[PDB]
Point group: C2
Chain length 245, copies 2
């Protein structure tokens, strides 16, 4: 019933549930030839300080650096990431963190989809910005969230003060759920990678599946429960290590 206005999407002051049928393809100067679905922009509800979008890259397309930090996570296909002198071919669940300004190129070796977080860097007087960082979600042997072995967390980026943010994945066995509703000053940006369940944000519960994007404003009560026969997995962004003032 999409053509009569029905959707699972919703927009609120401090959160938004963005589902695939509502997607709108636009474009970005640094991503010539690719289709861009910009899910979270600084202009959502009460405010956001980053952007999350997925780049649908046709085989052969090239994308170069922007003025911001760039975290690219390959959802499908194969993407060659060429930095200085060295270049690697990324496949499903491989990712790269590129410092703001780092000259580089992304080439789609085959039709691909890449999840991207872009954020400006908040320097710290005596700290040097982190260099390029590569990684694979699956090689990472996460930790039981808060002792729970049915909720595996995997920090994809070094948990160090030099970093501006963090990107991690949360995997829930069927029936598993966050220990409690979280309420913290860090805002979230998420993409449902695998599975389905009910996500609680403020007073409402939302049915969500792989493919959905969620914006969680600062201090937004948030909880999740995984349903179905498969494990749920979602990619998560959250600003970190900087004084809120």
């Amino acid at each position: 019933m999409k053509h009569l206005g029905q959707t699972r999407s919703a927009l609120h002051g401090s959160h938004a549930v963005i589902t695939p049928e509502t997607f709108v393809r636009t474009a970005l100067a640094e991503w010539p030839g690719s289709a861009i679905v910009l899910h979270i922009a600084p202009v959502v509800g009460l405010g956001a300080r980053f952007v999350q979008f997925t780049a649908e890259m046709p085989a052969g397309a090239q994308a170069t650096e922007s003025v911001y930090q760039r975290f690219a996570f390959v959802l499908s296909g194969e993407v060659d990431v060429a930095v200085g002198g060295e270049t690697r071919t990324l496949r499903e669940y491989d990712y790269v963190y590129l410092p703001a300004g780092e000259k580089h190129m992304l080439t789609a070796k085959t039709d691909a989809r890449v999840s991207v977080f872009e954020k400006p860097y908040q320097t710290v007087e005596g700290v040097q910005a982190p260099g390029v960082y590569w990684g694979n979600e699956r090689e990472n042997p996460g930790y039981p969230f808060e002792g729970d072995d049915h909720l595996i967390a995997r920090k994809l980026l070094p948990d160090e003060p030099a970093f501006d943010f963090m990107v991690s994945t949360m995997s829930f066995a069927p029936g598993a759920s966050l220990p409690y509703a979280e309420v913290h000053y860090m805002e979230h940006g998420l993409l449902m990678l695998e599975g389905e369940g009910l996500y609680k944000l403020e007073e409402n519960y939302y049915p969500v599946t792989a493919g959905d994007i969620i914006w969680m404003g600062a201090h937004c009560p948030q909880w999740y429960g995984a349903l179905g026969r498969n494990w749920s997995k979602y990619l998560l962004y959250k600003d970190m290590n900087r004084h809120p003032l």
Copy 2:
């Protein structure tokens, strides 16, 4: 925190979630020495056509027949049922269907808790009222609901046109859920026996656990999703086999 008005209970025109901390003990003529918690009565919101309550029987307590049909289901303890010329001890998950008027006595061998469904009997012309019937929830190896082996339904009373109603159990594996939201004329008397999860009634989602009672009004959209590590299981009541007019 209940002393400042906090509870997971909620009352509505077509549905209600009733939690253990809100229970009020009362008494019934046929249940001398026992405490009765009348959960659902014909006066709930828009109306009910039966009564659901639990009896907390102290060892030694004896209860006799009422003028209505009585379906007793043992939650804990042991209860002797003396009907016809025989007597049987009932323990956890043992139940008995007693025709309206049938003389009988329920004696508690030990402190017991009994879930009871009572209601008048609607006679059809060429249909003789059914006789006493015994069973045990676990004996009954149910059937996969919609062909889903993680959703086992167990009919506790024979599914014949002679019966005025039906009692059954719905069991869910940690990640299971009803395949679709249900909407039907027949009302519901629900008692959570095992597990926990989220019950959607109309437009809201309610977190519930073993112990919780739920009243679903006619045509009340309903759905359930099981969470946690254990299976969920709930006792269900619903009138059947009679023309609504």
